[PDB]
């Protein structure tokens, strides 16, 4: 859905600035589900970092 006003997705892209648009989709999606379980709509940084992990290397 949407990102928390304080989310910081920039941090996530700027790490190895070389991600296939597809991982971005996966990263973004996973982070959606994590936010879903916490019974929230808005996405927190927690979700994203935890998405980045199980989605890259």
């Amino acid at each position: 859905m949407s990102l928390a006003p304080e989310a910081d997705l920039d941090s996530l892209i700027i790490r190895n600035d070389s991600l296939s648009g597809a991982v971005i989709a996966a990263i973004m999606q996973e982070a959606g589900l994590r936010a879903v379980r916490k019974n929230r709509y808005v996405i927190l940084q927690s979700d994203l970092e935890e998405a980045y992990a199980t989605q890259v290397k």
């Binding site: 700027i14 790490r15 019974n39």
Partner: protein, 228 residues
């Protein structure tokens, strides 16, 4: 406790509701939800000025630093990422002021959060009350890495200038603030480093490339050498 109405009340900005929920059960003012967040958190996330200001009145003996959510984000952290100088000044001018350098689980400071998003006031405000312009996050990244990445000369001239920031440090990927401000292609920004704030550019990332090699497109690249 599945649902935490007071917090919700902060999201929806129902000022009364909140003031009405604290009345019924006081132990809520400082309760942590499934995100480790207390009310104040959300009242800052969505910028509920009245709610916030109020919420604080009963947290005047409360150290903001002692309330980081599950990501080490502090109500002053969320404050800085959002971009409201007011809301931030609000959380700052209080008996016990927050540490401008406390980091979050991935070690980023409010300066990063601020800089990255381009909140000049916020960025500047902080720099003025301490805020190390040199804190490395779990990627060996400092705010200037952020500033160059987006490319705001405005913040580049602030970190490097006033905050006498270091400019040749390389993150994990082995990138100086310059690589970043070239991969995202901000020629003008890139040159400002090298040119006005003497940024070395012959270094190479942890793969063998220089800032010129990891530039966005040739249009960008050329403009660099054709002006460095």
């Amino acid at each position: 406790m599945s649902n935490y109405p007071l917090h919700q009340a902060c999201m929806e900005n129902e000022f009364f509701k909140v003031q009405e929920l604290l009345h019924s059960k006081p132990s809520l003012l400082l309760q942590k939800d499934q995100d480790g967040r207390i009310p104040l958190h959300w009242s800052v996330s969505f910028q509920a000025h009245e709610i916030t200001s109020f919420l604080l009145s009963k947290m005047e003996n409360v150290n903001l630093d002692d309330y980081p959510d599950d990501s080490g984000w502090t109500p002053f952290h969320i404050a800085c990422s959002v971009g409201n100088l007011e809301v931030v000044k609000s959380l700052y001018d209080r008996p016990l002021k927050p540490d401008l350098n406390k980091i979050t689980n991935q070690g980023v400071t409010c300066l990063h959060l601020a800089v990255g998003k381009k909140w000049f006031e916020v960025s500047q405000f902080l720099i003025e009350n301490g805020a190390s312009v040199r804190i490395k996050d779990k990627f060996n990244q400092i705010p200037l890495h952020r500033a160059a990445s987006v490319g705001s000369l405005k913040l580049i001239e602030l970190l490097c200038g006033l905050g006498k920031s270091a400019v040749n440090w390389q993150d994990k990927q082995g990138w100086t603030p310059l690589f970043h401000a070239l991969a995202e292609g901000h020629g003008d920004a890139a040159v400002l480093l090298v040119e006005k704030y003497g940024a070395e550019y012959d270094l190479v990332d942890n793969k063998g490339a220089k800032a010129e090699d990891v530039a966005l497109n040739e249009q960008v690249k050329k403009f660099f050498l054709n002006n460095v």
